[PDB]
Design an enzyme around this catalytic site. Structure first.
Site, PDB file in Angstrom:
ATOM      1  N   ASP A   1       0.931  -1.168   0.000  1.00  0.00           N
ATOM      2  CA  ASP A   1       0.000   0.000   0.000  1.00  0.00           C
ATOM      3  C   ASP A   1       0.957   1.201   0.000  1.00  0.00           C
ATOM      4  O   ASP A   1       2.153   1.000   0.234  1.00  0.00           O
ATOM      5  CB  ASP A   1      -0.877   0.047   1.264  1.00  0.00           C
ATOM      6  CG  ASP A   1      -1.663   1.380   1.410  1.00  0.00           C
ATOM      7  OD1 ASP A   1      -1.576   2.032   2.469  1.00  0.00           O
ATOM      8  OD2 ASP A   1      -2.409   1.810   0.509  1.00  0.00           O
TER       9      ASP A   1
ATOM     10  N   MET B   1     -11.106   9.631  10.438  1.00  0.00           N
ATOM     11  CA  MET B   1     -10.324   9.031   9.341  1.00  0.00           C
ATOM     12  C   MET B   1     -10.873   7.617   9.137  1.00  0.00           C
ATOM     13  O   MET B   1     -11.015   6.842  10.107  1.00  0.00           O
ATOM     14  CB  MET B   1      -8.812   8.960   9.662  1.00  0.00           C
ATOM     15  CG  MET B   1      -7.891   8.938   8.413  1.00  0.00           C
ATOM     16  SD  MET B   1      -7.645  10.559   7.562  1.00  0.00           S
ATOM     17  CE  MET B   1      -8.514  10.328   5.953  1.00  0.00           C
TER      18      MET B   1
ATOM     19  N   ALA C   1       0.535   5.402   1.184  1.00  0.00           N
ATOM     20  CA  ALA C   1       0.611   6.256   2.396  1.00  0.00           C
ATOM     21  C   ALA C   1       0.353   5.464   3.707  1.00  0.00           C
ATOM     22  O   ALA C   1      -0.678   4.811   3.875  1.00  0.00           O
ATOM     23  CB  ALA C   1      -0.366   7.364   2.300  1.00  0.00           C
TER      24      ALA C   1
ATOM     25  N   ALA D   1      -9.358  15.984  14.130  1.00  0.00           N
ATOM     26  CA  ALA D   1      -9.333  15.603  12.726  1.00  0.00           C
ATOM     27  C   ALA D   1      -9.016  14.116  12.409  1.00  0.00           C
ATOM     28  O   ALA D   1      -9.612  13.525  11.511  1.00  0.00           O
ATOM     29  CB  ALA D   1      -8.373  16.541  11.989  1.00  0.00           C
TER      30      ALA D   1
ATOM     31  N   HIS E   1     -16.530  12.469   6.508  1.00  0.00           N
ATOM     32  CA  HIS E   1     -15.470  12.872   7.453  1.00  0.00           C
ATOM     33  C   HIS E   1     -15.662  14.353   7.824  1.00  0.00           C
ATOM     34  O   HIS E   1     -15.134  14.833   8.835  1.00  0.00           O
ATOM     35  CB  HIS E   1     -14.100  12.690   6.788  1.00  0.00           C
ATOM     36  CG  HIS E   1     -12.929  12.763   7.723  1.00  0.00           C
ATOM     37  ND1 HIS E   1     -11.930  11.809   7.727  1.00  0.00           N
ATOM     38  CD2 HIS E   1     -12.564  13.682   8.647  1.00  0.00           C
ATOM     39  CE1 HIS E   1     -11.005  12.134   8.614  1.00  0.00           C
ATOM     40  NE2 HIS E   1     -11.367  13.264   9.183  1.00  0.00           N
TER      41      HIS E   1
ATOM     42  N   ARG F   1     -10.861  -0.393  -3.167  1.00  0.00           N
ATOM     43  CA  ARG F   1     -10.914  -1.147  -1.909  1.00  0.00           C
ATOM     44  C   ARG F   1     -12.409  -0.911  -1.550  1.00  0.00           C
ATOM     45  O   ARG F   1     -12.989   0.128  -1.849  1.00  0.00           O
ATOM     46  CB  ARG F   1      -9.962  -0.521  -0.846  1.00  0.00           C
ATOM     47  CG  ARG F   1      -8.515  -0.834  -1.075  1.00  0.00           C
ATOM     48  CD  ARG F   1      -7.615  -0.070  -0.151  1.00  0.00           C
ATOM     49  NE  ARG F   1      -6.255  -0.269  -0.639  1.00  0.00           N
ATOM     50  CZ  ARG F   1      -5.144   0.318  -0.185  1.00  0.00           C
ATOM     51  NH1 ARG F   1      -5.153   1.210   0.831  1.00  0.00           N
ATOM     52  NH2 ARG F   1      -3.996  -0.007  -0.782  1.00  0.00           N
TER      53      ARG F   1
ATOM     54  N   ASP G   1      -1.720  -0.415   6.151  1.00  0.00           N
ATOM     55  CA  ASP G   1      -1.663   0.310   7.443  1.00  0.00           C
ATOM     56  C   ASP G   1      -3.013   0.694   8.039  1.00  0.00           C
ATOM     57  O   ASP G   1      -3.070   1.449   9.022  1.00  0.00           O
ATOM     58  CB  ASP G   1      -0.814   1.590   7.310  1.00  0.00           C
ATOM     59  CG  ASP G   1      -1.381   2.558   6.278  1.00  0.00           C
ATOM     60  OD1 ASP G   1      -1.354   2.210   5.085  1.00  0.00           O
ATOM     61  OD2 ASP G   1      -1.864   3.658   6.635  1.00  0.00           O
TER      62      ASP G   1
END
Ligand SMILES: [Mg+2]
Ligand SMILES: [Mg+2]
Lengths: 256, 256
Positions: free
Chosen positions: A8, A45, A10, A41, A52, A156, A182
């Protein structure tokens, strides 16, 4: 034998802590009068972009200095509007969040010297990948193959992108491929594709910390924060879990 | 839980013994002093018809005679000539073998009204499939989706065409699907992709017998030649064994 590994972007190979989105949202609120904590913030996520933003709209300590400022409460237009500005700002800064994560380079250059093969998937759009991918190559990283949600019917969680990698690399019984990510979103992709699935903790936005916070943090505040993430991976498919990429080889050896 | 079935075309859902190629496979070779047996020509059946002929050059008995009437082992011309000829002779009769094996339509309608999706793989080239489907459709059969060796990097044995069906039909886990064919090469495709692999016999090609040749068949001959085929499958990765396709609606409920 596993003949390929799938990565993956990031949080895994690039952007330690995956702060790229974080700063866009922060700004999309600072610039309007409201200041929002990195803890505010990074909670929603995981949802879609637009969900969001209605979430940052329903946290009390936020509505409560928005109606001190505009002297009204947040609107369906205000939400419809903060969304529009997302892309631009993300484009603007992306070239600053594409540094390959520490130590990742040395393991990859170790996989190829065994004849293993290298693919990758992301959530980022093809037009975003045109940037990330460019700055990563300048700084040292380019997978054998790359796919984005735009090459397949859906992104995804579906396994469509993983199947493409199989065709392109020429590998086939899937359980001959490992998948590394992650986030919760990443574990699901891997299972739904019948692949061996792994998770990483340090610098994985799920954890939320910055390289510096990780090193100077209290040995006991760290290990408990870690355990949370490792459980969250496991509870979602994760076949194995790792703290840093340098333990990946062992999870390959295990599998046999 | 099976949401989908992927069917081969010739000897599985249309023809009954194949044959459409058999006679066109033995002359191109007889024309040159070599003699080949229905058993030998029928051995590599299922590949892309370009890969098929090639496999006939790499058979030790055959080569032993491409070297008896010519020094030279056959090479790319001894191979791309017999082929050029093959398409000429075959493209003259094709529309004669686009007829549904008796009583298969009768199955396919029962599987549909039960919500299941039907897709398919083959060995014909897109040119050829463009003709056979055209007729098949008139005489009763048009599946939900078709994928030919021209739409991916390679043909049976590779799993690329099946992954495609999946991508296109919207089914996840690769074992929520049932693969069905009439040759050895069909049995491998199925397991190389993690699906339930099931072969058919009566009306197949590794039985290469006729509809009415199978009626006027003794019994001590019928009852055995069919094991000779039920054993050629299982030895190449078969999960189940059927005699005609009225017994499939069961090997589905069995998997559960
Ligand atoms: Mg990530
Ligand atoms: Mg066949």
């Amino acid at each position: 034998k596993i003949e390929a590994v799938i990565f993956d972007w990031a949080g895994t190979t690039v952007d330690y802590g995956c702060f790229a989105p974080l700063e866009v949202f922060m700004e999309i609120f600072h610039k309007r009068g409201v200041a929002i904590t990195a803890e505010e913030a990074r909670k929603p996520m995981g949802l879609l972009k637009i969900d969001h933003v209605r979430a940052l709209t329903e946290m009390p300590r936020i509505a409560s200095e928005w109606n001190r400022v505009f002297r009204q409460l947040p609107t369906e237009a205000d939400i419809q509007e903060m969304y529009e500005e997302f892309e631009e700002i993300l484009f603007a800064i992306l070239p600053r969040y594409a540094s390959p994560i520490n130590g990742v380079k040395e393991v990859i250059a170790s996989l190829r010297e065994r004849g293993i093969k290298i693919g990758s998937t992301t959530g980022y759009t093809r037009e975003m990948m045109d940037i990330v991918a460019k700055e990563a190559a300048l700084q040292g990283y380019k997978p054998d193959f790359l796919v984005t949600p735009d090459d397949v019917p859906a992104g995804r969680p579906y396994p469509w992108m993983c199947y493409k990698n199989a065709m392109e690399l020429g590998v086939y019984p899937m359980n001959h491929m490992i998948k590394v990510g992650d986030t919760v979103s990443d574990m699901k992709e891997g299972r739904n594709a019948g692949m061996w699935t792994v998770g990483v903790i340090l610098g994985s936005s799920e954890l939320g910390l910055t390289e510096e916070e990780v090193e100077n943090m209290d040995s006991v505040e760290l290990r408990e924060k870690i355990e949370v993430v490792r459980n969250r991976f496991v509870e979602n498919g994760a076949h194995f879990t790792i703290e840093t990429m340098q333990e990946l080889e062992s999870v390959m050896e295990h599998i046999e």
